[PDB]
Design a protein around this ligand. Structure first.
Ligand SMILES: NC(=O)[C@H](Cc1ccc([C@@H]2CC(=O)NS2(=O)=O)cc1)NC(=O)[C@H](Cc1ccccc1)NC(=O)c1ccccc1
Length: 296
């Protein structure tokens, strides 16, 4: 894929490759999302989950939430991309984390961006101010947090008040990824992704990681495109066969608009390429990425 990256760069055709991809993307029914009773469960009117992969809450009332299950079969990993929750869908958000047995949550956005609210404050900021979602009978408590330069990892306790059960949810918040933008560098992004991988949150023994930004397609799609590609070129007989454009389209069969700009697509090539060093054998690389990320 590196000779392709060069070819495209030298040609100045990212907008074209990206456009081809948008044009080719899957189009599936989003009936439930469009139901009139779910208008206030959707942050954006042009971003809905496909009925076939949408996540269904386990409640008879209304099992709708703007979230999609991205099941990458060959890569053997599943992600749930959802929108930044709305004031009225925080309980729903956590009901899904519980019901889906998720271990981690990856936030790649800020609550406020461009002076506009892009996501509700769905997690407690102070351990003393825990959150109780009366509608889904859940309790959320902040136990600790490790603040780095461009991201914060939080340790939350999600308690299902109905079953009396407790679960620790790791929160991975990338705080310096601008909307429609790209990480500050391949190393800062890779350092973050691998931070998420080491915790175990992406392991098959836990439910699918919940990944979201504001719409749950741009930055989320990017985070996932890179993770899935790195998974494929580690289990594939020939690492060179992995086609990022083709892997992206596959992902778009599960949720629309993954990757929102040509520059995020390009960045995705840079991340995978760089990340390939680790995949191909060299342990050192990661330690260098961390140094470069300047998390301190
Ligand atoms: N296209 C857009 O920019 C947004 C969707 C959107 C929002 C954020 C992103 C972000 C890009 C990124 O890098 N990461 S991300 O969180 O996916 C990517 C796409 N959509 C809207 O803003 C819609 C546009 C629209 C308006 C009318 C009919 C159909 C589409 N406005 C609204 O949805 C809206 C909502 C409430 C009040 C008024 C308008």
């Amino acid at each position: 894929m590196e000779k392709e990256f060069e070819q495209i760069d030298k040609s100045g055709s990212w907008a074209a490759i990206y456009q081809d991809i948008r044009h080719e993307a899957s189009d599936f029914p989003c009936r439930v999302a469009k139901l009139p009773k779910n208008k206030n469960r959707n942050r954006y009117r042009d971003v809905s989950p496909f009925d076939h992969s949408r996540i269904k809450l386990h409640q008879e009332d209304n099992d709708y939430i703007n979230a999609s299950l991205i099941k990458m079969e060959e890569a053997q990993r599943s992600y749930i991309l959802t929108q930044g929750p709305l004031p009225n869908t925080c309980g729903h958000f956590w009901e899904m984390v519980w019901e889906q047995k998720s271990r981690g949550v990856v936030m790649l956005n800020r609550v406020m961006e461009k002076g506009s609210l892009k996501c509700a404050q769905y997690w407690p900021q102070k351990e003393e101010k825990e959150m109780i979602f009366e509608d889904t009978n859940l309790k959320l408590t902040l136990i600790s947090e490790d603040i780095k330069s461009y991201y914060t990892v939080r340790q939350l306790e999600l308690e299902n008040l109905t079953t009396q059960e407790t679960r620790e949810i790791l929160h991975f918040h990338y705080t310096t990824w601008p909307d429609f933008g790209v990480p500050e560098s391949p190393a800062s992004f890779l350092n973050f992704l691998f931070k998420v991988r080491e915790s175990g949150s992406l392991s098959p023994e836990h439910g699918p990681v919940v990944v979201h930004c504001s719409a749950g397609i741009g930055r989320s799609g990017t985070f996932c495109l890179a993770d899935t590609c790195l998974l494929l070129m580690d289990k594939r007989k020939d690492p060179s066969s992995v086609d990022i454009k083709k892997v992206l389209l596959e992902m778009r069969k599960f949720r629309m608009g993954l990757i929102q700009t040509a520059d995020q697509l390009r960045f995705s090539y840079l991340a995978v390429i760089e990340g390939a060093k680790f995949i191909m054998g060299d342990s050192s690389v990661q330690d260098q990425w961390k140094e470069l990320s300047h998390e301190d």
